[PDB]
Design an enzyme around this catalytic site. Structure first.
Site, PDB file in Angstrom:
ATOM      1  N   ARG A 164      11.366  25.091 -16.077  1.00 39.43           N
ATOM      2  CA  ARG A 164      12.040  25.290 -17.354  1.00 39.43           C
ATOM      3  C   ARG A 164      13.398  25.967 -17.157  1.00 39.43           C
ATOM      4  O   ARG A 164      13.802  26.847 -17.928  1.00 39.43           O
ATOM      5  CB  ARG A 164      11.160  26.077 -18.319  1.00 39.43           C
ATOM      6  CG  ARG A 164       9.861  25.377 -18.694  1.00 39.43           C
ATOM      7  CD  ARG A 164      10.152  24.065 -19.419  1.00 39.43           C
ATOM      8  NE  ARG A 164       9.010  23.578 -20.180  1.00 39.43           N
ATOM      9  CZ  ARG A 164       7.975  22.937 -19.632  1.00 39.43           C
ATOM     10  NH1 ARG A 164       7.943  22.713 -18.323  1.00 39.43           N
ATOM     11  NH2 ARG A 164       6.969  22.514 -20.386  1.00 39.43           N
ATOM     12  N   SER A 237       5.752  25.291 -27.279  1.00 42.01           N
ATOM     13  CA  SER A 237       5.346  26.493 -26.568  1.00 42.01           C
ATOM     14  C   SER A 237       6.494  27.495 -26.512  1.00 42.01           C
ATOM     15  O   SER A 237       7.616  27.149 -26.126  1.00 42.01           O
ATOM     16  CB  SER A 237       4.885  26.136 -25.158  1.00 42.01           C
ATOM     17  OG  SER A 237       4.800  27.313 -24.367  1.00 42.01           O
ATOM     18  N   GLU A 333      10.993  30.295 -23.750  1.00 40.02           N
ATOM     19  CA  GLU A 333      11.477  28.970 -23.415  1.00 40.02           C
ATOM     20  C   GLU A 333      12.646  28.574 -24.323  1.00 40.02           C
ATOM     21  O   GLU A 333      13.660  28.074 -23.820  1.00 40.02           O
ATOM     22  CB  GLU A 333      10.324  27.966 -23.518  1.00 40.02           C
ATOM     23  CG  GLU A 333      10.708  26.531 -23.252  1.00 40.02           C
ATOM     24  CD  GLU A 333       9.484  25.627 -23.193  1.00 40.02           C
ATOM     25  OE1 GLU A 333       8.456  26.035 -22.596  1.00 40.02           O
ATOM     26  OE2 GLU A 333       9.533  24.524 -23.780  1.00 40.02           O
TER      27      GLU A 333
HETATM   28  C1  LIG Z   1       6.732  20.284 -31.142  1.00 43.16           C
HETATM   29  C2  LIG Z   1       7.476  20.570 -29.866  1.00 43.16           C
HETATM   30  C3  LIG Z   1       6.917  20.200 -28.648  1.00 43.16           C
HETATM   31  C4  LIG Z   1       7.577  20.444 -27.448  1.00 43.16           C
HETATM   32  N1  LIG Z   1       6.965  20.052 -26.265  1.00 43.16           N
HETATM   33  C5  LIG Z   1       7.594  20.280 -25.141  1.00 43.16           C
HETATM   34  C6  LIG Z   1       6.957  19.870 -23.904  1.00 43.16           C
HETATM   35  O1  LIG Z   1       5.868  19.319 -23.800  1.00 43.16           O
HETATM   36  N2  LIG Z   1       7.681  20.154 -22.781  1.00 43.16           N
HETATM   37  C7  LIG Z   1       8.922  20.774 -22.746  1.00 43.16           C
HETATM   38  O2  LIG Z   1       9.455  20.964 -21.649  1.00 43.16           O
HETATM   39  N3  LIG Z   1       9.514  21.165 -23.910  1.00 43.16           N
HETATM   40  C8  LIG Z   1       8.882  20.927 -25.043  1.00 43.16           C
HETATM   41  N4  LIG Z   1       9.484  21.301 -26.235  1.00 43.16           N
HETATM   42  C9  LIG Z   1      10.784  21.994 -26.187  1.00 43.16           C
HETATM   43  C10 LIG Z   1      11.895  21.181 -25.536  1.00 43.16           C
HETATM   44  O3  LIG Z   1      12.739  21.999 -24.719  1.00 43.16           O
HETATM   45  C11 LIG Z   1      12.766  20.601 -26.633  1.00 43.16           C
HETATM   46  O4  LIG Z   1      11.913  19.997 -27.595  1.00 43.16           O
HETATM   47  C12 LIG Z   1      13.835  19.671 -26.080  1.00 43.16           C
HETATM   48  O5  LIG Z   1      13.682  19.654 -24.662  1.00 43.16           O
HETATM   49  C13 LIG Z   1      15.209  20.217 -26.387  1.00 43.16           C
HETATM   50  O6  LIG Z   1      16.060  19.131 -26.773  1.00 43.16           O
HETATM   51  P1  LIG Z   1      17.074  19.284 -27.955  1.00 43.16           P
HETATM   52  O7  LIG Z   1      18.064  18.108 -27.953  1.00 43.16           O
HETATM   53  O8  LIG Z   1      16.362  19.513 -29.245  1.00 43.16           O
HETATM   54  O9  LIG Z   1      17.825  20.622 -27.511  1.00 43.16           O
HETATM   55  P2  LIG Z   1      18.293  21.749 -28.531  1.00 43.16           P
HETATM   56  O10 LIG Z   1      17.117  22.488 -29.058  1.00 43.16           O
HETATM   57  O11 LIG Z   1      19.074  21.033 -29.622  1.00 43.16           O
HETATM   58  O12 LIG Z   1      19.133  22.587 -27.503  1.00 43.16           O
HETATM   59  C14 LIG Z   1      18.501  23.555 -26.641  1.00 43.16           C
HETATM   60  C15 LIG Z   1      19.549  24.136 -25.724  1.00 43.16           C
HETATM   61  O13 LIG Z   1      20.216  23.066 -25.013  1.00 43.16           O
HETATM   62  C16 LIG Z   1      21.603  23.128 -25.232  1.00 43.16           C
HETATM   63  N5  LIG Z   1      22.136  21.766 -25.266  1.00 43.16           N
HETATM   64  C17 LIG Z   1      21.762  20.781 -26.149  1.00 43.16           C
HETATM   65  N6  LIG Z   1      22.405  19.656 -25.998  1.00 43.16           N
HETATM   66  C18 LIG Z   1      23.295  19.909 -24.938  1.00 43.16           C
HETATM   67  C19 LIG Z   1      24.240  19.123 -24.307  1.00 43.16           C
HETATM   68  N7  LIG Z   1      24.500  17.842 -24.618  1.00 43.16           N
HETATM   69  N8  LIG Z   1      24.942  19.681 -23.286  1.00 43.16           N
HETATM   70  C20 LIG Z   1      24.676  20.948 -22.954  1.00 43.16           C
HETATM   71  N9  LIG Z   1      23.795  21.788 -23.488  1.00 43.16           N
HETATM   72  C21 LIG Z   1      23.111  21.215 -24.504  1.00 43.16           C
HETATM   73  C22 LIG Z   1      21.769  23.898 -26.545  1.00 43.16           C
HETATM   74  O14 LIG Z   1      23.043  24.518 -26.626  1.00 43.16           O
HETATM   75  C23 LIG Z   1      20.657  24.934 -26.410  1.00 43.16           C
HETATM   76  O15 LIG Z   1      21.079  25.983 -25.550  1.00 43.16           O
HETATM   77  C24 LIG Z   1       8.834  21.075 -27.466  1.00 43.16           C
HETATM   78  C25 LIG Z   1       9.397  21.449 -28.686  1.00 43.16           C
HETATM   79  C26 LIG Z   1       8.731  21.204 -29.882  1.00 43.16           C
HETATM   80  C27 LIG Z   1       9.365  21.603 -31.189  1.00 43.16           C
HETATM   81  C1  LIG Z   2       3.636  23.708 -21.333  1.00 40.44           C
HETATM   82  C2  LIG Z   2       2.966  22.340 -21.332  1.00 40.44           C
HETATM   83  C3  LIG Z   2       2.534  21.596 -20.196  1.00 40.44           C
HETATM   84  C4  LIG Z   2       2.659  21.980 -18.716  1.00 40.44           C
HETATM   85  O1  LIG Z   2       2.772  23.183 -18.344  1.00 40.44           O
HETATM   86  O2  LIG Z   2       2.656  21.062 -17.850  1.00 40.44           O
HETATM   87  C5  LIG Z   2       1.980  20.404 -20.740  1.00 40.44           C
HETATM   88  N1  LIG Z   2       2.094  20.497 -22.061  1.00 40.44           N
HETATM   89  N2  LIG Z   2       2.684  21.654 -22.417  1.00 40.44           N
HETATM   90  C6  LIG Z   2       2.979  22.114 -23.780  1.00 40.44           C
HETATM   91  C7  LIG Z   2       2.227  23.116 -24.387  1.00 40.44           C
HETATM   92  C8  LIG Z   2       2.515  23.548 -25.682  1.00 40.44           C
HETATM   93  C9  LIG Z   2       3.563  22.979 -26.389  1.00 40.44           C
HETATM   94  C10 LIG Z   2       4.323  21.981 -25.794  1.00 40.44           C
HETATM   95  C11 LIG Z   2       4.031  21.563 -24.499  1.00 40.44           C
END
Ligand SMILES: Cc1cc2nc3c(=O)[nH]c(=O)nc-3n(C[C@H](O)[C@H](O)[C@H](O)COP(=O)(O)OP(=O)(O)OC[C@H]3O[C@@H](n4cnc5c(N)ncnc54)[C@H](O)[C@@H]3O)c2cc1C
Ligand SMILES: Cc1c(C(=O)O)cnn1-c1ccccc1
Length: 337
Positions: A164, A237, A333
């Site tokens: 992450r 998460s 995160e």
């Molecule tokens: C329901 C839910 C489930 C999720 N499940 C997972 C999962 O299974 N695994 C996981 O790893 N994550 C998970 N996430 C979180 C995950 O990090 C985000 O959902 C996604 O990766 C972020 O994309 P975004 O475009 O929304 O970024 P944003 O939230 O819009 O941005 C996050 C950060 O990235 C930066 N950023 C955005 N776009 C750019 C760009 N073009 N250039 C540079 N910096 C930029 C922003 O400035 C900010 O600092 C989950 C989130 C939710 C709400």
């Molecule tokens: C952290 C995680 C993994 C992993 O650690 O590989 C797989 N699913 N998720 C997850 C859990 C809660 C919310 C979103 C994603």
């Protein structure tokens, strides 16, 4: 751009937090990013880049220019036989991108199915799930450098991908990702390893285990565990899983027999943060309009009209309560703004 002045961000962040931005702008391509960047300077504002706002926690009104990435384009660059290099613009919605690849006949993204957000943000946090992280298939990206404005290419090593983590989260606000290139595969033996994903695939008959199959599976598990932000504001998460040295591991080991941990290759133990927060009696917590989920203890939620500060304060409460009871610091995160 499609510029908007002093306008809400509730429909722009999965927590659903209503704070205003001094300026909102929607970027359709790189020409639109440049001007949006000359505005932020030509009006003395800092610039805050967002994608889907699903890794983002907003706590105050944003005296910035908020630039929402909406760049569009999904393309096969190279076709080698067993590997295919594909390229997508930063504002491309991630999950439809995954579907696009599977549609084209490609494997590699299937375990990242249904993850929210944009292609542009995916390298930021090195998005991971079900044993797969974006680096496994990451080939290169193009980013705008905000020190001088010069585009450069980042191969995989250059991105210093971590759990992450990445050079772009280490060096925040420097780099603005425009394009992402991943190498996907065809007809590779199936990446699955004793989990519910397998259990539920092999019940379907598993004539052949195609990525499209495992991707259909993973959605279903996602749709059953994970709270949809369309109903309960959350950013998935909230805490990363902490990893402890073998000494910290050994002491907690013979203090709680349960201790859901996972051993790494460097020797150290990565604790399940879901356990820690649940062992801390936090599961199902609710104070005001915020809490933690009743099942997935890693998911902090806005039941209705919360402030980002309240969310931020519950986070901090949990971190102290954990650290003051187990001696581990839970890192977040999402990025806080
Ligand atoms: C329901 C839910 C489930 C999720 N499940 C997972 C999962 O299974 N695994 C996981 O790893 N994550 C998970 N996430 C979180 C995950 O990090 C985000 O959902 C996604 O990766 C972020 O994309 P975004 O475009 O929304 O970024 P944003 O939230 O819009 O941005 C996050 C950060 O990235 C930066 N950023 C955005 N776009 C750019 C760009 N073009 N250039 C540079 N910096 C930029 C922003 O400035 C900010 O600092 C989950 C989130 C939710 C709400
Ligand atoms: C952290 C995680 C993994 C992993 O650690 O590989 C797989 N699913 N998720 C997850 C859990 C809660 C919310 C979103 C994603």
């Amino acid at each position: 751009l499609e510029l908007q002045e002093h306008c809400s961000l509730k429909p722009y962040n999965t927590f659903g937090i209503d704070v205003r931005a001094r300026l909102l702008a929607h970027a359709r391509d790189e020409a639109d990013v440049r001007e949006a960047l000359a505005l932020a300077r030509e009006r003395g504002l800092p610039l805050l880049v967002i994608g889907g706002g699903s890794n983002l926690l907003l706590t105050r009104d944003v005296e910035a220019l908020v630039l929402r990435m909406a760049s569009q384009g999904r393309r096969i660059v190279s076709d080698a036989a067993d590997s295919v290099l594909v390229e997508a613009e930063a504002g491309e919605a991630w999950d439809p991108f995954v579907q696009w690849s599977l549609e084209r006949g490609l494997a590699g993204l299937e375990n990242l199915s249904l993850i929210p957000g944009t292609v542009g943000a995916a390298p930021m946090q090195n998005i991971g799930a079900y044993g797969v992280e974006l680096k496994d298939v990451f080939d290169s990206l193009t980013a705008l450098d905000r020190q001088d404005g010069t585009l450069r290419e980042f191969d995989r090593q250059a991105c210093r991908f971590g759990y992450r983590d990445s050079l772009f989260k280490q060096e925040p606000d420097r780099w603005l990702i425009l394009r992402v290139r991943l190498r996907l595969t065809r007809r590779e033996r199936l990446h699955l390893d004793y989990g519910p994903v397998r259990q539920r695939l092999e019940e379907e008959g598993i004539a052949s285990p195609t990525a499209r199959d495992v991707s259909r599976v993973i959605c279903a598990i996602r749709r059953e565990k994970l709270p949809d932000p369309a109903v309960l504001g959350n950013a998935g998460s909230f805490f990363k899983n902490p990893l402890v040295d073998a000494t910290q591991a050994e002491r907690l080991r013979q203090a709680f027999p349960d201790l859901v941990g996972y051993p790494q290759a460097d020797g150290r133990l990565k604790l399940a943060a879901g356990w820690l927060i649940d062992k801390g009696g936090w599961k199902g917590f609710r104070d005001g309009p915020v809490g933690v989920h009743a099942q997935q203890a890693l998911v902090l939620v806005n039941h209705g009209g919360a402030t980002g500060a309240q969310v931020r304060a519950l986070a901090e409460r949990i971190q102290e309560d954990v650290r003051r009871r187990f001696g581990v610091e839970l890192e977040p995160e999402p990025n806080l703004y």
